[PDB]
Paper text:
H5 and H12 in the 6-helix bundle are discontinuous. dimer indicates clusters of charged residues on both sides of the membrane. transported by [name], K+ is not. structure thus serves as an excellent model for the membrane part of NHE1.
The structure of [name] crystals grown at pH 4 was determined at 3.5 Å by molecular replacement. conspicuous differences to the pH 8 structure are observed near the dimer interface. Six ion bridges that lock the two protomers together at pH 8 break at pH 4. As a result, the two protomers tilt away from each other at lower pH. the cytoplasmic end of H1 and H7/8 present at pH 8 break at pH 4. the 6-helix bundle, but significant rearrangements at the dimer interface. site in protomer B changes only slightly from pH 8 to pH 4.
Numbering used by the authors:
A (entry chain B), C (entry chain B): 1 to 420
B (entry chain A), D (entry chain A): 2 to 420
């Protein structure tokens, strides 16, 4: 079939998305696994959408959708609230993310023999976190104000970072894919240390440039004074993708850049008392509307990601490695998190921290990166990265997300009473 | 790969923003600014690979159009249609087709091209979109009913302006797509077959259209979905469903989507059935949904215009503007009136001359500008030399530009000097 | 596989061609059906070459190969020898070709219900003749000098003409494919008469223009005086394809044009006694070499055509309609020819003509046009021309060529003694 | 579709003919005339769509090359090779590679491009083909052995000039094709891995080459085929077989074919086995076959050159000729000698300087000119920006032109002033 098949796919996607959201609206079950299972049914079960096409879309979505999503997530948070607990988090992401990634790598490595790189990329994928399916649930069981903040921040920050780790890990697996400066710093200064140097490098660059472009955007809106639709929205998207582009060109993760810009505009209010208020309020409201708009967009993107992930998976590989994946998953949930969150114990009680450690689930970003290695393997051949291992990784990640979301979402309340 | 895409989207959207700025503060209509800026971005700076832009255009040509026409379908009043339904119907069937033919004759006798090619050009330049005229309407206080009938004309010509292109296109491909139209053409000749095919198309499209609209509303009732993002996802879903099925039955999915848009945009009808209580809520929810979609459609519009700007090549358009302008003036001065003269029986002569004269060509042709060239270049069909493609496309560009601008300058003079 | 699969295909083609030619060199059996069967084996039997790829090549070959072949065939004959029997032949081709085409159309029509057009195109395909596999055989059994000439001429002339009929017939089946002037003359003056008017038209145009370009070529070689390789060869090809191009642009069969040019250069010797002989002999020999070269080329092309035809066929359709095809074939052989060659009886005896009528076989051109309708059906969809009918036509043609060549080649000698 | 193709072939071949004419009567070498005429035909007249020409080039790049290199393999003397085999081997391995590297350094420091891109450029401009020099050789009476070693250098550099390109190309594609070279690069680094890969390639290619050659001759004996067209079909068949299998085992099929060409061209060897009676006949049959194939190869050569002429775009080449010429002079004056200095140990200094200086770049680079651009444009690989492609290609054009012409003008002066 021709591009009308793509449209058909689109309709099926959105429709099923709506349906699933209805299920969640009508049943306390999180919408994520519903999305996934729905994708599975709509895909492999009924062969309505083929995996090849599914992936063909999935790359596009993997880019744009994630950009929008991350940007918006950038918009959502509040800098004061994060500054409140700033020292805690930076370590938390940096150490946790990497440590979780590394240890799970070791974890993955044992279950199926693989060069570390494979494991490390697995963890790098599972790196990110998404308690977006818990945030409502927290309010639903009188969860304290304080921790929700730091967790939210953790997710919003680690989402792009998991990618970086992933892109780093992948770059290690395939020579040409690695950017220039990484290659240089690697050959020159080893891979272990090179990873770190490039880490601090691209992080610093990305965040700084993100700030730059962000405030530049703010000033632009200031002078231009665009309070009316749709130019503000268009400008927003253009800005995000700009940050992403430039960021990626300079061998950095443009995702983090855009995200950062989102944080800026989302939490930047600098003005001279000489300035009128006729414009500040207009820009405020404008920003608000644009934000909500992109919230909708990001929602769409999210739905796409989960469902497509659903129709992406190969049942055979899954079932074949069903159990193993499970062990890996629960293992990750109950070992990777607590062990990588140990060095925060000096800030909260042996009981207190246990919650936030044991609670962290895995969602969007890893769901979107599950097919990436497979994508490459299909696109480019490499002995280090077999297609086989691609399918394996993807399957395991699927299981991981499922298990994580389900178990965490289910066992939240029990924790509360049993800890507070 | 995707990096270049990101760059492109960035500069396009940014471009659009800037263009809306300069249009805002200079008061000039935004469209020509769009086209010219796109011109800058593609060929002038050589920043954008024309062919990639062509790919993106291949993307937008269906989806952007679907969305745009859907939202257009929303912004409609069934009542105001009901008032002048015969005027409209006469204007969008007979008038449109006649316009196509006439334009065809023009193109033929100006380029020595085959009449089929000319007719293709006509079909492409059929649809109109005077969204830029509206502010001038409410500003110079043009009579309401006129504005209404013109608008309602556009909303209907946009999708009908598409099928006719697909017709001529299908006529160029020797196999005729092996579709219904092929058969009809074989059993009754191309003319008759074409007519019957048209009627089939429109009929089924509208029936299935209102069908899906109703099914949609009903679905909302049973499901009771009133919140973002569920409602929007639903809307898009329905749109593309309509389109997909539409084309699946060889009918203009665009027409279908538009019709569904009409349904939703004009559905306070089954309100007295259920308690109005929740119904008001769904009404306003639909309203905000519509607004959102309006924004989307605006975006897609920007895409289309700017991309059209970038895709053209100055060599051809220059070498052929000397004739091109003449073609444009030609259609503006001859095609519309001769096609709208049957409408003289209902309305006044002055009113007639006005509504005929004021006929700007907008988005839809721009979206179909590259289409013949694309099909020619891709399918490598013998009847469609690529040069012909460039010719048509350029001609379309000229036409659009000139039409939009002089129509935009017509009003103040055109009103007072006759009405 | 990538374009190396095409190369593989090439090797297989030529190799098997060589093999088959060895068989014919080592066994009196004509090389044509050997080629075909070889193609069948190498194709459908072993799936070494897929039908899709096979056809993809087959279009290319269908063009260029035929051009070269027809051109060379143009070169081969001698104008004096044809002028000897000129009145006989013109009628013979014109009437026979059309009549054979028409009657076989009726013949095809009865065996399987079809609109005439289908039958007419069948006959149009079977139109051409190729006794190239008999020409040696004639010498092998002391066949008289006279008839071989007229038959040779008949083939060389009817080969392009069968195409025209075919292209005409096809054009009738698919609207857009028909050229401009045919369309006009058809709508204006009916299809029956339109066919004739366009026939005389494009024939006259093609032959005239062919002469023009031909002598133009001769003069060019004269002034330029290119006696050395390879410029003469390149120029030859360029000329042929030129004639073909221009011919096709003016809604005429460029094949016939090129062929005609070939006839010209092959048999044109005009010079002033004032002119030296140092150049005439050089151009003579040059022409000779170029001719032989293109003979080789044409041979290659021929091999391609037959073998690819072999790997093109669908065994299922064949077997399904095996018998029917046979009846059609022998029917054609024993009815179409004699009945369409009746009006030459006023020139030769009731016995004499019977030979040349009953002997005409069908070869190259029809072998190359067997897949054309199918080609279109696959490329373009049309209710009048189903893919089904495409496969059918192709199969029937295959059977026809096989049967024709085999039976004629086998039963030649018996005729001689039993008639002379 | 095919109509345009026919037009193209017509004008190309005709063009070639004319070019050979003007080259014949003006005495000037035919190659630059080829390139310039192609220039006329493609961009100048806009007669030929550059991209279609690119397609055709994609066709010729394998087949034309296979034939050309095969026939080249024929025209060879095993004896004369045996004489200076070490000189040759040293010249085609170490010398060639060194030339590539040096050119790479140049390209890098002149365009700021990555060293890999430069090296790609080097690999492309590696191979040489001085077929235009031969007449000047026999005319100005250059020493025989020199001519021989240079020729035998070319015949071997042509295919080796290809693999190195495929190397750098493979290096650009991140997956490295997942081939042997990938593995070797992973286990031993790109340098070592590349070397070992090279040795593997050459070894297997030659072994299998002579294998197929022998198998070919033997086949002829058993089959006793001495006549057109059987013999020719056979030849081509064998060539493409060699190529196919060659590439199937990730080896340069070009190298294989060339080697088989060497085998056939130099096989009077097993004559004393069988009665020479029929053997003389097969010998001469092989001779005429070779001649035929020579004609073919000439044709393909014309194709390649003219097409190269048509494919380029004057904008880029102009905007970058200022540097381009410098790059060319650069390689001619620096790359060869520094790469041929190890050959100083065998031959005299004057002879060395001569054979080094006189190093024209011919067909093979021209065939690989568009290849990086093609792969970049098609695969859309991130490391290969299309602009880079245009740059490389143009640079190659400049290089070829200048090299050929100044080398062609070198000889008369270059001989007497030092030898
Ligand atoms: C700018 C002019 C003032 C207008 C403010 C715009 C609305 C911002 S307030 C904005 O409202 C949402 C939908 O009503 C609420 O979202 C809530 O989430 C709940 C979680 O199950 C759902 O029941 C929703 O129905 C809603 O009650 C609230 O969490 C959010 O903060
Ligand atoms: C121009 C200088 C003189 C050289 C003349 C070139 C050769 C032209 S003569 C040219 O020779 C062919 C191959 O030997 C012959 O072809 C013959 O056909 C026979 C049919 O089974 C085969 O046995 C062949 O071996 C050969 O004897 C002959 O029919 C043809 O006419």
């Amino acid at each position: 079939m021709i591009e009308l098949s793509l449209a058909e796919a689109l309709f099926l996607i959105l429709f099923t998305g709506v349906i699933s959201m209805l299920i969640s609206r009508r049943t306390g079950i999180s919408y994520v696994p519903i999305f996934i299972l729905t994708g599975l049914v709509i895909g492999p079960l009924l062969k309505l959408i083929p995996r090849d096409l599914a992936h063909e879309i999935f790359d596009f979505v993997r880019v744009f959708g994630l950009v929008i999503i991350l940007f918006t997530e950038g918009h959502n948070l509040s800098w004061r609230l994060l500054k409140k607990n700033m020292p805690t988090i930076v370590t938390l992401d940096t150490i946790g993310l990497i440590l979780t990634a590394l240890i799970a790598g070791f974890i993955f490595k044992v279950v199926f023999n693989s060069s570390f790189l494979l494991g490390f990329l697995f963890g790098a994928i599972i790196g990110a976190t998404d308690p977006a399916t818990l945030i409502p649930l927290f309010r639903q069981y009188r969860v304290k104000q304080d921790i929700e903040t730091v967790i939210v921040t953790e997710s919003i920050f680690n989402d792009p970072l998991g990618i970086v780790l992933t892109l780093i890990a992948i770059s290690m697996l395939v020579p040409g894919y690695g950017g220039g400066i990484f290659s240089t710093l690697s050959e020159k200064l080893g891979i272990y240390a090179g990873g770190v140097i490039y880490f601090l490098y691209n992080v610093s660059v990305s965040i700084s440039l993100g700030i730059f472009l962000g405030i530049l955007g703010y000033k632009f809106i200031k002078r231009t004074g665009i309070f009316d639709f749709p130019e503000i929205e268009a400008f927003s998207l253009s800005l995000a993708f700009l940050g992403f582009f430039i960021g990626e060109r300079l061998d950095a993760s443009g995702y983090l850049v855009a995200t950062v810009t989102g944080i800026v505009l989302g939490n930047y209010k600098l003005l001279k008392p000489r300035e009128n208020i006729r414009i500040l309020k207009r820009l405020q409201r404008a920003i608000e509307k644009e934000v909500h708009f992109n919230d909708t967009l990001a929602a769409l993107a999210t739905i796409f990601i989960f469902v497509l992930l659903g129709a992406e998976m190969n049942l055979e590989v899954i079932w074949s490695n069903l159990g193993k994946g499970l062990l890996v998953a629960l293992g990750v949930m109950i070992l990777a998190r607590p062990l990588a969150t140990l060095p925060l114990l000096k800030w909260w009680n042996f009981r207190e921290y246990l919650f936030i450690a044991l609670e962290g689930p895995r969602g969007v970003v890893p769901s979107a990166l599950a097919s990436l290695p497979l994508s490459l393997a299909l696109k480019y051949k490499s002995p280090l990265l077999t297609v086989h291992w691609g399918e394996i990784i993807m399957a395991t990640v699927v299981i991981t997300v499922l298990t994580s979301v389900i178990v965490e979402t289910l066992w939240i309340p029990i924790l509360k009473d049993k800890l507070d």
